[PDB]
Design a protein around this ligand. Sequence first.
Ligand SMILES: C#CCN(Cc1ccc2[nH]c(N)nc(=O)c2c1)c1ccc(C(=O)N[C@@H](CCC(=O)O)C(=O)O)cc1
Ligand SMILES: C#CCN(Cc1ccc2[nH]c(N)nc(=O)c2c1)c1ccc(C(=O)N[C@@H](CCC(=O)O)C(=O)O)cc1
Ligand SMILES: O=c1[nH]c(=O)n([C@H]2C[C@H](O)[C@@H](COP(=O)(O)O)O2)cc1F
Ligand SMILES: O=c1[nH]c(=O)n([C@H]2C[C@H](O)[C@@H](COP(=O)(O)O)O2)cc1F
Lengths: 316, 316
Amino acid sequence: MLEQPYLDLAKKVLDEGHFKPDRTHTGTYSIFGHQMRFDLSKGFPLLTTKKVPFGLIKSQLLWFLHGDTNIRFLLQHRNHIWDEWAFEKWVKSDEYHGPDMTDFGHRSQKAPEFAAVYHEEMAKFDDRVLHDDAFAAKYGDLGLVYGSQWRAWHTSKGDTIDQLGDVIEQIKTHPYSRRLIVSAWNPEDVPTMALPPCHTLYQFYVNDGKLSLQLYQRSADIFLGVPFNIASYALLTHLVAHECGLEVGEFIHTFGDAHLYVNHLDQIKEQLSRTPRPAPTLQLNPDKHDIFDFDMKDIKLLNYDPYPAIKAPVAV
Amino acid sequence: MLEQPYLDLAKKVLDEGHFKPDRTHTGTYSIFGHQMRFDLSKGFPLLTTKKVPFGLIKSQLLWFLHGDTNIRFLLQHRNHIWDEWAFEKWVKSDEYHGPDMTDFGHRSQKAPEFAAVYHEEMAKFDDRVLHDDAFAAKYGDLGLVYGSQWRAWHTSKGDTIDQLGDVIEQIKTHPYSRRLIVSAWNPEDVPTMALPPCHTLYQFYVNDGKLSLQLYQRSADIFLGVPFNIASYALLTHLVAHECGLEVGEFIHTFGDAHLYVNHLDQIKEQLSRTPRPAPTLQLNPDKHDIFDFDMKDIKLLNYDPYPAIKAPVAV
Ligand SMILES: C#CCN(Cc1ccc2[nH]c(N)nc(=O)c2c1)c1ccc(C(=O)N[C@@H](CCC(=O)O)C(=O)O)cc1
Ligand SMILES: C#CCN(Cc1ccc2[nH]c(N)nc(=O)c2c1)c1ccc(C(=O)N[C@@H](CCC(=O)O)C(=O)O)cc1
Ligand SMILES: O=c1[nH]c(=O)n([C@H]2C[C@H](O)[C@@H](COP(=O)(O)O)O2)cc1F
Ligand SMILES: O=c1[nH]c(=O)n([C@H]2C[C@H](O)[C@@H](COP(=O)(O)O)O2)cc1F
């Protein structure tokens, strides 16, 4: 079945896992080291044992897949996953001056009155962004995010290398090469960023005509973060092979610290009260080949019958 | 037993492996994706089923572990593993002008007369290096090799980040962090190098006082290259914990393309005619703490009873 992978990763953590403090409060139960593997020939591992929502996953990928470091496309696609860091880079400073708000969010996962401000002054924020190009360009252009990492490596001699572009042009001409990597971890930049890229390195592979991919994710939350991650990189592979004219092999997903949060383990146990159903299947439009173009009307997920969605608290 | 890992990786390739052309002639049998794991508490995985030689492994590590991009320390330590690329960057050019030699080596693994030249003009090379500082500094300073990758990241704003230094100072103060990485893959530099770093990324981990490490190696030869690699990173971990005052956890070693060469598979089958013996145990001197200092008289391997060494041809 395609998603038993997750359920044996998540099972093995609350069984083998050993406790660690984190970079917040809530403890983690962590394993270090896992290869999880999915056979893309017969699927698209979006969890049938918990609604996970393909729409925000597509948007986010597509944002990444064509330069963007600016949340104004994400906002205007009803997606707000990367919304708050834009507010941290602003609540703090010199145009804004308003509410209490310096530090919000965690103290809004359980708040005071906070909800009508963290939700209403960072409403006004995300609004001005979508309509004020000036404002968009500043407090909504996040800088360094996977988008500028894959498509824009800033180099010691002035300019930017579009790495993923180059690896999709190697996939075509030179298929069998052991070099087919996109790193997202740049040292000049990591004694700095809010989050360093959690999705560090991913190499690709052809062999027999179908493209595998492997992703080393350095820090992974078992419950909330790992559902989107399997699916995104699975969506990213389906898209590279429709470009490079290849079939689908594997999506292999490796880990450093796969960790569960102690504040959401009653909830993972409830997910294991469910048996996986038949796995869903994606569609990508034939009339669009340069993967760089896809809108939402170019990737269709079909026949996803999920079990009810299970809620958990971003403490980060 | 600690090295059955290798023998089930190497077994699984000539069994599951599927054929691929490479960046040379000789075909490969390759798997893509493996986590291999060793429990350093009870060992030091140097193969007992084939002599592998700790001396050249120590030298090479130590070279790496204190700035060097120059083979004059490697030469003067009777090690010549990185010797020939120094000769390719020279056979080719303007001080040298001598023998036929432009392209040598492969055509010396099976040569014409080649042996008394590839071996005698690149004798004269490695000699002048060890005695002529001028010459050392040029045709023996390899530039970018793991040494300048770990200890010298060249940055867009002028200077060099000593990454490994910084990660050993984080290991001390902040132990439990999901950030403890040293990448060796720099994009500005990889549309270029002879070999891109085969040992791309490695993150570390404490938890309960003993340090694990995990290495994603992008391209690995099963037979010749993978023996040194398990041991080096195992030696590298033993050294970080004696610095950071930690015990030893695991050494986890992940793969992209683990591949065997078709020209050395009679030879791997002969290694599997042997049962592993008791695994060897290393020593690191108590009076030397800054790992940055170790000479050869600071790491002792004890009680390594190996099976005879099994020879195989560098075609690259
Ligand atoms: C990328 C990026 C930046 N971020 C920020 C961020 C903050 C805390 C985190 N916490 C955990 N455990 N994992 C994460 O991936 C994570 C990411 C993201 C923002 C939201 C979601 C997300 O949709 N969360 C839940 C929604 C339910 C809820 O909390 O109310 C989900 O659908 O699973 C994922 C990533
Ligand atoms: C690092 C680096 C650069 N290099 C260059 C280089 C060239 C061809 C290769 N071929 C293979 N299969 N794997 C490699 O790691 C490799 C590396 C190295 C040079 C020598 C050895 C080595 O000692 N080889 C054999 C020696 C026996 C022989 O060939 O006569 C061994 O001990 O296993 C390893 C790495
Ligand atoms: O440190 C090294 N490791 C390594 O394994 N090789 C070789 C053999 C390996 O199989 C190949 C990597 O494949 P590619 O041909 O893509 O470089 O280079 C060379 C080195 F310098
Ligand atoms: O893309 C992302 N992935 C991710 O998982 N996180 C979170 C949750 C994860 O557990 C943590 C990574 O650990 P660290 O605290 O070391 O950053 O950051 C945030 C993102 F933006």
